[PDB]
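Dear Dr. K.,

Following up on our conversation at the group meeting, I've run the structure prediction for cAMP-specific 3',5'-cyclic phosphodiesterase 4D from Homo sapiens. I'm pasting the input sequence below exactly as I used it, so you can double-check it against your construct before we proceed with anything downstream. Let me know if the numbering doesn't match what you have in your notebook.
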Amino acid sequence: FGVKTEQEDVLAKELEDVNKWGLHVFRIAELSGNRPLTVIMHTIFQERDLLKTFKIPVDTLITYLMTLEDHYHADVAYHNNIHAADVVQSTHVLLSTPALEAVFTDLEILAAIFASAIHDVDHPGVSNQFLINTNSELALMYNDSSVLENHHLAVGFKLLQEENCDIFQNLTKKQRQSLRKMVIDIVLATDMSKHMNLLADLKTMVETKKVTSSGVLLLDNYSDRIQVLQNMVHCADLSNPTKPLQLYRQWTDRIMEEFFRQGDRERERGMEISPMCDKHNASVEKSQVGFIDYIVHPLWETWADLVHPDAQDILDTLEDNREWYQSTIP
Ligand SMILES: COc1ccc(C2=NN(C3CCCCCC3)C(=O)C2(C)C)cc1OC1CCCC1
Ligand SMILES: [Mg+2]
Ligand SMILES: [Zn+2]
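The predicted structure tokens came back this morning:
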């Protein structure tokens, strides 16, 4: 023909939800033959007209996206291509918030989306502390400093050098240096060791926020523009408890599989078992409530303040999910 297969048609219909919080991302993964990152990135690039704006050849974009997706580990339950696709799509929705309308440049939008796509690539499904404590090659290469996040960046960039993978081949050197610095600043900010300082800075910005042209955020220096993008992708990375419960519970099952497997590797090696990694001493419900109360709600309450009232429904879903997990603490 020159028309979609029936499986491609069902995928195209699910992808009509790409602009919505609560996309059926697991169904997209199944329908695309485990290509959720490639199909969601391609959809977003076409929707935001990024191929025309950045003169990206479409065969190059698809080759890079398949290569990138292939470097996510299919044997890792959480930190895989489905999580990458979810953070991309969640960033895409946050960038579209009315409070940020016409704030960011096309290059900043490309930086936030590309950062989201690469931000966990080649994740081995164990923590930075695990890699440091095992004397792993990755921890030695990065001198024990944001080990995974340094690695995700290095892999995401190095894959541009594979055959027909250089999606930035038509950008000027000035565009490429600006894009590269923003992408590095965003992915390094996904290290949970940076969370308390990012949140402190987001609160300072909400406290002294200016809303110029009568409605929309004023961000007039790199420090403030990159802090908003860093917090936005960090919000997307920590968005699972803000999603409809059927999605949240799938993410909880996956992160607990990954954590319990790390705890099994710690226990078999006689290491201290990391927080929430002991399947024999586990309180999944209590852990989700503590995670929401100490990390996710303080972040999303502050984001919701920055973009008030755009994120009210997201904060309400988070609060409903928190009450649901509390109510099932045995
Ligand atoms: C759906 O539940 C979760 C989704 C993502 C996370 C994460 N947050 N973190 C931090 C790390 C610092 C030490 C403490 C862990 C939190 C991460 O490193 C990742 C990205 C894996 C956590 C999620 O929930 C887990 C299971 C129970 C509560 C934390
Ligand atoms: Mg990460
Ligand atoms: Zn992540």
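Two things stood out to me. Residues 1-330 form one domain. The two ends are 57 Å apart (CA to CA).

Best regards,
J.T.
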